[PDB]
Amino acid sequence: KLVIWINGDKGYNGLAEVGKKFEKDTGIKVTVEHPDKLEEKFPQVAATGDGPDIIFWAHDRFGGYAQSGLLAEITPDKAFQDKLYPFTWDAVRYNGKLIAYPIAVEALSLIYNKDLLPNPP
Amino acid sequence: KTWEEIPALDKELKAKGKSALMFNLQEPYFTWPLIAADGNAGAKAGLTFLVDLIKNKHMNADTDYSIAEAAFNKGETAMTINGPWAWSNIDTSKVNYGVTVLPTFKGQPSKPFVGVLSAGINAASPNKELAKEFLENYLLTDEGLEAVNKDKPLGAVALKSYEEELAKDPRIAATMENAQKGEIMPNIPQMSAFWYAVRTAVINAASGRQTVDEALKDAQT
Amino acid sequence: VGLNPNFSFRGKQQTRIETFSDAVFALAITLLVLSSTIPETFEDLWASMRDVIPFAICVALIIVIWYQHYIFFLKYGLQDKVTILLNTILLFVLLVYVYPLKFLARFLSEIYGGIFGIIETDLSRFGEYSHQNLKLLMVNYGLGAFAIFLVFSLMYWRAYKMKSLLDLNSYEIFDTKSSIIANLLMCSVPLLSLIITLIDPWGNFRTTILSGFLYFLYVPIMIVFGRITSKK
Amino acid sequence: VGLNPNFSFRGKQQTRIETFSDAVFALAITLLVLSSTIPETFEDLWASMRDVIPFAICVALIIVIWYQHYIFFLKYGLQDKVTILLNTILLFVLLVYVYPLKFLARFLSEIYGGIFGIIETDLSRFGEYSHQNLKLLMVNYGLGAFAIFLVFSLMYWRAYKMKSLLDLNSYEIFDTKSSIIANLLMCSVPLLSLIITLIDPWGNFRTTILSGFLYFLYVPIMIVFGRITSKK
Ligand SMILES: OC[C@H]1O[C@H](O[C@H]2[C@H](O)[C@@H](O)[C@@H](O)O[C@@H]2CO)[C@H](O)[C@@H](O)[C@@H]1O
Ligand SMILES: [K+]
Ligand SMILES: [Zn+2]
Secondary structure, eight states: OEEEEOOTTSOHHHHHHHHHHHHHHTOOOEEEEOOTTHHHHHHHHHHHSOOOSEEOOOGGGHHHHHHHTOSOOOOOOHHHHTTSOHHHHHHTEETTEEOSOOOOOOOOOOOOOTTTOSSOO | OBGGGHHHHHHHHHTTTOEEEOOOSSSHHHHHHHHTSOOOHHHHHHHHHHHHHHHTTSSOTTOOHHHHHHHHHHTSEEEOOOOGGGHHHHHHTTOOOOOOOOOEETTEEOOOEEOOOOOOOOTTOSOHHHHHHIIIIIISSHHHHHHHHTTSOOSSOSOGGGHHHHHTOHHHHHHHHHHHHSEEOOOOTTHHHHHHHHHHHHHHHHHTSSOHHHHHHHHHO | OOSOSSOOOGGGSOOHHHHHHHHHHHHHHHHHHHTSOOOOSHHHHHHHHHTHHHHHHHHHHHHHHHHHHHHHHHHTOOOSHHHHHHHHHHHHHHHHTHHHHHHHHHHHHHHHHHHHTSOOOOSSTTOOOOHHHHHHHHHHHHHHHHHHHHHHHHHHHHHHHTHHHHTOOHHHHHHHHHHHHHHHHHHHHHHHHHHHHHHOSSSSHHHHHHHHHHHHTHHHHHHHHHHHHHHO | OOSOSSOOOGGGSOOHHHHHHHHHHHHHHHHHHHTSOOOOSHHHHHHHHHTHHHHHHHHHHHHHHHHHHHHHHHHTOOOSHHHHHHHHHHHHHHHHTHHHHHHHHHHHHHHHHHHHTSOOOOSSTTOOOOHHHHHHHHHHHHHHHHHHHHHHHHHHHHHHHTHHHHTOOHHHHHHHHHHHHHHHHHHHHHHHHHHHHHHOSSSSHHHHHHHHHHHHTHHHHHHHHHHHHHHO
């Protein structure tokens, strides 16, 4: 069973559709989970118990997992490495070792109702 | 904008095979606004005009709720007097309708009677706490009054949260315009006998049995 | 773009009255400038550039009216006989006061030109500055401004009279009702000067000083009339 | 039709500001030509045909502004108070320099008419060609051109200030940002001449030769200012 841990505020149903296409082409089940406080539940469960096969979280929490020895070193071929931006690969690098695959850049923004507020602050 | 220019509009419309105004004359709730427009002299003045419309063959004698609604919805009459609840059936018909202020009579406005639809629990019921639950937690809610309003409109709902949705409706604005020109009905126990006295008085004067002066005489007793 | 968020703009599609009305507006600001004589020499060139300050005031005033027109026909989208009538009364007034504004803008730019000390050119060119002419000056432009805002109030009330046909909601009724009071309050100041000049309490320049001084106290006097109606 | 393939044109529907603005534009090119006197005889007829070269330059210049206006209101589709304001400042400038352009176009066509050797008619008709008049000539049209491009830059920045309301994408943000720099760079050359004429380093015609020579070095000086901002 391929089990994935990702936050409930992300596209887990969409990640499951990718997982369903994976089981069609290979035969491996892909369940997606979104437990509360997974950033601090992952290092406790993965250290002792089985936990997930893959963990999705912003790159800031991964240095602590890398120091603790809770993440396998990533070894992706050149062809795959070249598909992503070289700046994204740096964020997922701890002590000269790639510790995760970069998905996307996130940044908070001011969301505003144009009807209640056309010219916002 | 005035009741006194309807006979002229009816003469103009009857030439094209159409009526000017058809509304329920049997129930006194619909005739009361015209009757209480000036005021007594105001009731005598108001009812004589209503009798003159029927005497001049502008309005039919036994105009009830069904033949007035059907006539407006079919497109046989230009106007009608009805409440919020009536709009859903017009929307269903292919009629481009508009809700507006009631016509003025003798300069002053027609004063309708403002009603408050209310749910009361029957004293001889064993399901009092089950009905309270239903009325409070299920009906009198944003979701509960929505389900009723989309079937047949409730009018200016009592729920504070609906204020913006009610203020977005052009027809609820006309309803509140008429409600301010009218007045709320006193809940008193004599309302039943009053409503009966006005119901009979209007029917007798409309059919042609009792005089307008003798109608207010029997109704004041 | 729009004034209110609760307002639903009926006149978003362009119409004949709107097009026709823009055309007149464009002509007023254009002919006010281009009615001037064509410079044939450097002396005429420098003379014509002194006219920009007067013309800037004229255009600023005309587009402000064009804006209030644009906003009205954007809100209601009206196209009826009575709207066509009132609208013509408006563009008719605009049109008759175009050139008299060029005159007043030039006249006032020379008086203020003398006060600030920028220029020192004569004012004998403008005629005889007598009590009757200076009185007729106020009464004229006062009557002119009052008509414009009186017409705007009449147009908002025509929309209000057709509130059910336009399907105006409670927010749109209140805007329309407020826009009438706004334009009547704007037409109260020129009307009050005009009335004071015509009666002539002093029989001398003092009358014209007061009538002119009501325009400098525009905002405060508009607040007094507005407060009086709310206090009761 | 359109400038960029990545740009999504918001102002594809025609509006009051656009209609009103076309009307003013059409009047400027029309009154520049038709403000001339009506030929009553063959002598007047041949005289009026000598005016085509000056008028061709005037119209060529006016439609270029009309184009930049058309493209702006096609891109963003704006209709707000601040856009209405800046737009009026624009059509106001256009309007005041219509006839002075007719003057400059005639004046420059007689100087170039004398150089190429096509005609040999006098230039005493135009006034006294003195240092102060020729200085005021530059300062005038320089101030005029600077204002036009300064306004265009102010309008692209107003759109940029409303980038989120218009829902501009990264390609549309870059176009808008580039259009500001483009119009500021266009307004830097008349501003630099104007500044050089007003200070007057030489106190003689040399000043006017330089100020005029910056227009012949328009493209190269626009590239110098552009390179300076990128080099740092
Ligand atoms: O006609 C007299 C009748 O009028 C009112 O009843 C209204 C009711 O309030 C409305 O909600 C609607 O149902 O129509 C009724 C008239 O048909 C009074 O409430 C009632 O006492 C009175 O009998
Ligand atoms: K003329
Ligand atoms: Zn014209």
